[PDB]
Amino acid sequence: ASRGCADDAGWNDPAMPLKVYGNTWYVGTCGISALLVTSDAGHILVDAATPQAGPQILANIRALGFRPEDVRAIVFSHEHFDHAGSLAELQKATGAPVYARAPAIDTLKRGLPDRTDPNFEVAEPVAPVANIVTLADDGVVSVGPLALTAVASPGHTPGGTSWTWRSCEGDDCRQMVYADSLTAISDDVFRYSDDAAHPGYLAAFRNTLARVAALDCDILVTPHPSASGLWNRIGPRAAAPLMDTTACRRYAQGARQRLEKRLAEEAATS
């Protein structure tokens, strides 16, 4: 029997791919999520993990019996190197457009962020993405019968987005939420409390927390699987229910607490 994945797993430690629910499959690593949402009209790939993960994700797609060439759209959570790292690599393999909100586009074209990213100084360089479709802040990405709805989620980054869709097993349908990271982390320079340096940025983060908390949410998945306890819900170590309609609300409330701790830390330092 396989032992499964650790919560502190390396971002590049391989995971055996497995069904999340219905036509939503996990194709990421033990430390970093990626999902494949499938149909007989083609598929949608959600996230790209770490600049080193293009081959694992592609291998995992094929392990499940799906073809990367049948992916017709790529979406992602946010424009940090540990989630957007293998986008260009995946675009070549699939031929699919990458959808991105306006505040992430320059980062995707450069392969590095600018000072609008809290984590600017710790960014690792990515391959640029050549074919980007600009995504409205409440846009829907459609591939045949599939429809993924964007929920703009700025705060952890300017361009972050959460995604929601329905997956079914027979007549039993679930609202899936791939909620963006909500951690108030940064490089050693950025201050969330310095509004003059980035007017409205922290207010937008608070608004994201409220919006995520309110989402209809049967099954939550997050870019770092441990942020939603994913390996306690699927795979060999599963001991808690996959479905929990309180998960989004609890995820956002914890994030709000941690955001306010970060503000306290900033108040304590010059």
230 near Zn ion (CB under 5 A): no
What are the two backbone dihedrals, phi and then psi, of residue 20, each rounded to the nearest 5 degrees? -90, -60
* Closest distance of CB 247 from Mg ion, Å: 6
**Nearest alpha carbon to residue 48 among 78, 15, 17, 5:** 78
State yes or no: residue 80 binds Zn ion (CB under 5 A): yes
Q: Between 193 and 246, whose beta carbon lies closer to Mg ion?
A: 246
Residue 82 in the binding site for Zn ion (CB under 5 A): yes
Residues 95-154 that bind Zn ion (CB under 5 A): none
Question: Residue of minimal CB distance from Zn ion?
Answer: 80
* Residue 247 CB coordination number (10 Å): 23
- 180 interacts with Zn ion by CB under 5 A: no
Residue 65 CB, nearest distance to Ca ion (Å)?
Answer: 28
Distance CA 162, CA 171 (A): 25
47 binds Zn ion per the rule CB under 5 A: no
- Residue 251 makes contact with Mg ion by CB under 5 A: yes
DSSP for 118-171, written as a single string: TTGGGPPP-PPPS-EEEE-TT-EEEETTEEEEEEE--SSSSS-EEEEEEEEETT
153 vs 167 by CB, closer to Zn ion: 153
Query: Residue 4 interacts with Mg ion (CB under 5 A)?
Result: no
Does 83 appear as a known binding residue?
Answer: yes
Q: Identify which of 24, 82, 76, 17 has the alpha carbon closest to the alpha carbon of residue 49.
A: 82
Can you give the C-alpha Rg of the chain in angstroms?
A: 18
Nearest to Zn ion of 120, 253 (CB atom): 120
Residue 43 labeled ligand binder: no
> What does the alpha-carbon distance between residue 133 and residue 126 come to, in Å, rounded to a whole number?
18
- Annotated binding residues for Zn(2+), written as ranges, equal 78, 80, 82-83, 156, 216, 218, 224
